[PDB]
C-alpha cells in the first residue's frame, strides 16, 4: 500500500504486515487508499464499512 | 413607384434581381478561356467550377474549388466567352 | 498569559537575481522550542509580489508567487512559484461587444518544472470600424487558440525555468501571440493571464543559490 497512489482501489488488504490478507475480501467490496505518511511509514485506508 | 417598366427593365435593375427572379431567368456564371504559362494551349474552365482541374498531359492543378467562383493559380489568364 | 511576539524573528526575503529589486519584506516566525525548527515552518511561504516593487519601473498589474525554498539565516531564498494578474486588470479586459479567447498549456521545461500557462486574447475593434460587434467565427477562435498553444510549447519546452521568467517579466509570450494572430483575427489585449506551478523535481540547494547569483 506504500507503493500506490491515494484513491487506489484494493482488496484482500493486510491489517498488519505479514498476516497474508485479512481486510476487504468479501464479494464486490473495496478499500480506498486515502493518504500516506512517509515519516512513521503509515497510510489511512477507508474500509468497506466506511471507517478509515 | 406605381408606373414601373416591368415590360422593359434597365440593365442595372437585372443585376439587383436574383438569377431566378430576373424577368427572363439567366445565370450569373460564365465559361472562360483559361491557359497556364507552363504549356502553350487554352482549356475551358467553368466559373463556379466546384472541382479541381488537372492540366493536360498531367502538368499540375489550375482551378481550386471555393464557396462560389473557384480560384485560378496566380498568373492563369481568363477571358469570358461571347455566347 | 504571555506574548507570542517575544519570540518573533524578522528575516530578509531575497528575490532570485533574475529580478532587479532585492528587498520584498520582513516576516515574523517563532524560534525553535520543542522539535520543529524556525527554518522548517518558513520553508513554504508563497510570496505574491507585484512586478513594479520586484522589478524597477515597469507594469504593476502582474504578480509572482515566490516559495521560500531553503532558509539559510536572516535571509529567505524565494523561487518563481507562478505568475498572477491583478483582477483589477483581468476584469477590466473582459468587456462586452468583443470575443474573449483563452488557451491553457500543460508544459514542462528542460529542468523538470512543469508549469501550466494560461493565455487570454481579446479581439480588437479597428480604427475605421463602425460595426459595434467585432466578434470572431468559431473556427477563427480555435485557429487562434491552437496558435496560442504551439507558442507556449515553443517558449517553455525549448529553454529552462530561469530563462522563461525573463520572458514573463516582459510580454515576450503576450506579444508573440498578439502579432501572430493579426492575420487570423486582429486582437489587442493579449497577456499570459496566469502561470500555476504544478510539478518541481527533486530539490538541490545549488540551483536555488544559482538563481540568487
Amino acid at each position: 500500500v506504500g507503493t500506490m497512489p491515494e484513491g487506489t482501489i484494493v482488496c484482500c488488504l493486510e491489517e498488519k504486515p505479514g498476516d497474508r490478507g485479512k481486510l476487504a475480501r468479501a464479494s464486490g467490496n473495496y478499500a480506498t487508499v486515502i493518504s500516506h505518511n512517509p515519516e512513521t511509514k503509515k497510510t489511512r485506508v477507508k474500509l468497506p464499512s466506511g471507517s478509515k | 413607384p406605381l408606373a414601373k417598366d416591368l415590360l422593359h427593365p434597365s440593365p442595372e435593375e437585372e443585376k439587383r434581381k436574383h438569377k431566378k427572379k430576373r424577368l427572363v431567368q439567366s445565370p450569373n456564371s460564365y465559361f472562360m478561356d483559361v491557359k497556364c504559362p507552363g504549356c502553350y494551349k487554352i482549356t475551358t474552365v467553368f466559373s463556379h467550377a466546384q472541382t479541381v482541374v488537372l492540366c493536360v498531359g498531367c502538368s499540375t492543378v489550375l482551378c481550386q474549388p471555393t464557396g462560389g467562383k473557384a480560384r485560378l493559380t496566380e498568373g492563369c489568364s481568363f477571358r469570358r466567352k461571347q455566347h | 498569559v504571555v506574548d507570542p511576539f517575544s519570540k518573533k524573528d524578522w528575516y530578509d526575503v531575497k528575490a532570485p537575481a533574475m529580478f532587479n529589486i532585492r528587498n520584498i519584506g520582513k516576516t515574523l516566525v517563532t524560534r525553535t522550542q520543542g522539535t520543529k525548527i524556525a527554518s522548517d515552518g518558513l520553508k513554504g511561504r508563497v510570496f505574491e509580489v507585484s512586478l513594479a516593487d520586484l522589478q524597477n519601473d515597469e507594469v504593476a498589474f502582474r504578480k509572482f508567487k515566490l516559495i521560500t525554498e531553503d532558509v539559510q539565516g536572516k535571509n529567505c531564498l524565494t523561487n518563481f512559484h507562478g505568475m498572477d494578474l491583478t483582477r483589477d486588470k483581468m476584469c477590466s479586459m473582459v468587456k462586452k461587444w468583443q470575443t474573449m479567447i483563452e488557451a491553457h498549456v500543460d508544459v514542462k521545461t528542460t529542468d523538470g518544472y512543469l508549469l501550466r500557462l494560461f493565455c487570454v486574447g481579446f479581439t480588437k475593434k479597428r480604427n475605421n470600424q463602425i460595426r459595434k460587434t467585432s466578434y470572431a467565427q468559431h473556427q477563427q477562435v480555435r485557429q487562434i487558440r491552437k496558435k496560442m498553444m504551439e507558442i507556449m510549447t515553443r517558449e517553455v519546452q525549448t529553454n529552462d525555468l530561469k530563462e522563461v521568467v525573463n520572458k514573463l517579466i516582459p510580454d515576450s509570450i503576450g506579444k508573440d501571440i498578439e502579432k501572430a494572430c493579426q492575420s487570423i483575427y486582429p486582437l489587442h489585449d493579449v497577456f499570459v493571464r496566469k502561470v500555476k506551478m504544478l510539478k518541481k523535481p527533486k530539490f538541490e540547494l545549488g540551483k536555488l543559490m544559482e538563481l540568487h547569483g
Binding site: - | - | 511576539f5 519584506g25 520582513k26 516576516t27 515574523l28 483589477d88
Partner: protein, 136 residues
C-alpha cells in the same frame, strides 16, 4: 518585538485581509506571505450589539485597534486585500470597508497596494434561497 530594520523612514510592509461582509467587518493584518498573522480585531469585538457589527463606526474602532498593535510590532506599511462575502453569495464589499481602510490610513499606517480577493466562482454551486427567491 524588536526587528533588525533601519528606522530612519524605511517601510516595513505586511498584507492585511479585509473580510468586509454585510453583517460584520474583519481587519486581519498578517505578514507579506499571510501564513503568520499579527492582530485581527473586528466590528463584533469593539461593539457588544449585533445590528452595528457591520456599521462604519465598528470597523473604524477595529482598524484603529489594529493600527496601535501594528505600530508596536514593527510594521510601518500595509498591503490591503479587500474581500466580499464571496462565492455563490454577494461579490460587493459591505458598509464597513471604506471606514476601516480610512481608519488605519488616518492613524499613520502607510498604504502599499489595494486589490479585491473576493472569492468569485468561475461557476457556482446552487446559492441558498428558493426558486421563488427570499420573500419578505
Amino acid at each position: 518585538s524588536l526587528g533588525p530594520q533601519v528606522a530612519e523612514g524605511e517601510n516595513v510592509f505586511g498584507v492585511c485581509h479585509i473580510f468586509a461582509s454585510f453583517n460584520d467587518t474583519f481587519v486581519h493584518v498578517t505578514d507579506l506571505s499571510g501564513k503568520e498573522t499579527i492582530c485581527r480585531v473586528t466590528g463584533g469585538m469593539k461593539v457588544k450589539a449585533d445590528r452595528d457589527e457591520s456599521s462604519p463606526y465598528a470597523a473604524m474602532l477595529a482598524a484603529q485597534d489594529v493600527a496601535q498593535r501594528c505600530k508596536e510590532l514593527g510594521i510601518t506599511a500595509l498591503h490591503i486585500k479587500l474581500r466580499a462575502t464571496g462565492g455563490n453569495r454577494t461579490k460587493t464589499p459591505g458598509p464597513g470597508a471604506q471606514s476601516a481602510l480610512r481608519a488605519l490610513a488616518r492613524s499613520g499606517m502607510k498604504i502599499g497596494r489595494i486589490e479585491d480577493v473576493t472569492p468569485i466562482p468561475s461557476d457556482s454551486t446552487r446559492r441558498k434561497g428558493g426558486r421563488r427567491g427570499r420573500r419578505l
